[PDB]
Amino acid sequence: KPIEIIGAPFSKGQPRGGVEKGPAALRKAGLVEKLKETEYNVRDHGDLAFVDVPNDSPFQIVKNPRSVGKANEQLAAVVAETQKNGTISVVLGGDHSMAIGSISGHARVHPDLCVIWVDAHTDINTPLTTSSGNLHGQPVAFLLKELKGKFPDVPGFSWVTPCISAKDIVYIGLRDVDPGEHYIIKTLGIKYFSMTEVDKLGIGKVMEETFSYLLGRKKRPIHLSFDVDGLDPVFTPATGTPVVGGLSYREGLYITEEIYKTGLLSGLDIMEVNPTLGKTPEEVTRTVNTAVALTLSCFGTKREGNHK
């Protein structure tokens, strides 16, 4: 089984443009080289050439709808094509709005996949509940079967088909959820482990519980959408929406080590790394290196060591 890195230098899912540099900063930290030292064969697609839409007025409150919807249609066609060739897609972001295209394309080939969304946010606001309009806080909304028809058709997303149900996803890290989002997860009954559940159970029992909940009936492809701001700002400071009291460095590596060991990882997203959001140069380095470490962990590297 081979790996396929797909760079997604996109930022129109939020205000700050530095995220577009996430793919390159991750590559400069030696990501591909290090991944080639693991047990997998690594292929590097390169970065996607995102087509900008000049005339892109806000859809009501939704901003850059057409630029975002197009950028994701491209990504979805590339992930599906790589998934079609039996390779594990590894998407390096921009903003988390790229998960729409990452998961959509993936679910075309493995419609039975489940989603492990690591984030301090649920990113499940719809065009009608969002208060900012930033589409990086709405991906989950465009992906859920149950939320289909709950908001008006957004320009640029006609190609989108909600093919993943609320029972196929688990959240880990939540600590900053909007009122509408909380209402949505409770009504639809989306499984989650906010920081409260992590403190209550411990990361160990948390992973055991998300696997039994998602892989209890039958084993299936796993799509991990890791938002760097899932970890505490002390570890991943270079992100546009840091929330205090998050997952630790250790807890993050635990999550990935466990997903690795399942043997089911099929798709992976490393989102929201913004190399221009460091208070100090070292804060950017600390963030990048942590993202690279989490990515490697997903593909073999264990803290107990490794050997051939």
Add this chain to the structure above:
Amino acid sequence: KPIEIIGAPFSKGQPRGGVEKGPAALRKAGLVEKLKETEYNVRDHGDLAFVDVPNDSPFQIVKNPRSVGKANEQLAAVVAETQKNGTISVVLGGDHSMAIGSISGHARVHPDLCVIWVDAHTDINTPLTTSSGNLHGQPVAFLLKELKGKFPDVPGFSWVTPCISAKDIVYIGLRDVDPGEHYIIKTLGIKYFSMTEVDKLGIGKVMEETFSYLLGRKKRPIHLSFDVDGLDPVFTPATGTPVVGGLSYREGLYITEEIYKTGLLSGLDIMEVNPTLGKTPEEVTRTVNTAVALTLSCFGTKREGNHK
């Protein structure tokens, strides 16, 4: 059920006077506004006008006995009056010596209440075991039935009646206990979870265990006396007696979230916040904001989110 904020700008329980500014710094951080956004109706009594006692020589080694004993007699009459009107008292301190008056008044209306004392210290030295004389490290001593008559009558505290027994309180966070205090808790058999027990069990099992121990027989009013230095100096640096290896931000919010969910919180203290003890302006901001967050957590705010 309504909430009642009672400011207690008192500092004569220890050396440093900045604590008297704790109530105002907490209000400046938007405490009342934020509390009014929760599901409770919030009333703000204001700050107590503490009568200073000019001639207040040390009782043996005890300092400012009369000023402290008077200040607490006032507070006790106000908390009892608010408790008498079916409202939840929320006392913002100074030093922890104000817990004597906070709990005493509370126990007049709910003599069946239990106490969850979150602190890095036991604050159970008596006038005869204390080595500093600072009454903020002796409140528990003036409140316990079993410790009545174990030390001579201190001027200013004649109004005090030890109405809470050693079996009604649980400690969480302990990591700096004096020899006499350790002897006292072991002889009286006061339940506690020092940092050792938190590391052993995990905060989750710790709360489950203090609730079963205190609310096992019958459910009763809970009085939470939270000492800001209960959390690690990394979170609550602006306190006069910080000890390393304390509760985390996450663990602190867990404690309050769980007390909230019990539906039994009857009285609350937010003590030892000293807005003049910050190494840097941000350390003061970090401390205040954490105290405000813990207070809000006690009244509804959950990390998983909320909605109407």
Add this chain to the structure above:
Amino acid sequence: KPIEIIGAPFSKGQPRGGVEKGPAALRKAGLVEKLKETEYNVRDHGDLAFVDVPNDSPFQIVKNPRSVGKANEQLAAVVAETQKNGTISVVLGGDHSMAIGSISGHARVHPDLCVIWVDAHTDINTPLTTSSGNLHGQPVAFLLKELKGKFPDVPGFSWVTPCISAKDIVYIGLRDVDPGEHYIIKTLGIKYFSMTEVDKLGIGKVMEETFSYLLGRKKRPIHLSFDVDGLDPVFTPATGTPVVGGLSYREGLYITEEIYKTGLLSGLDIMEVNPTLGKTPEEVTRTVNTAVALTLSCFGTKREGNHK
């Protein structure tokens, strides 16, 4: 039962010479005074006078073989002599290469002892697997019965006899293990709790599990070899080989508190403290004080308090 502090100002087990100052920095922090306040009688042997070997060319890749092998032969004779007099040896290092002599001498008197190696590294590279040649990352190699004859005879270590088997040791803290080391621990089946197992189980269950594994059949002398870089660089920054995502201050004290409570501690090492590796003066102070605290914890001091 008495305690015996044996200073081991040695650094030839690695590049940086500051470690030779570890014993003195620890004494300057008031170690002996504080240890004399515990329930034990404390004896201070002083620092060993290490004989330097002028002509000491690398054995193949192994550096300072003869200087290290001699320094440890001395230490082994002193620890065995103190162990012979029924006292608990407390060796203050330099580099971890001194554990060879510390444990060897100890095992002469208590050949039934088990080893609790707290470190971010396994220090089990042999003269043929090591890539650096630094003997502080090879002690365990010269001590294991199963690894006898697996590498050529190193000058300076003829006196060495591997008397401890792979089933008598448990590792805690691992997060930076070499390929050969990982192969060695898995083939020999050495018990370990890397950071992954600590996150999975919690430090509490981790200690319960190492005690049942090592003291299940019969109770026996415990030799704790604590490498300061076992804790996160945030607590013990002044070490030559810091790895991120390590044990916390709390977790470290937990380990020692539990070993204390077993009543079986027979030998103890406080290694890799380098008072010249502080980014700032406070980082050195933070490291020393943490090492002193861990040492005291091993001899009585509990976070819940103490009394006579």
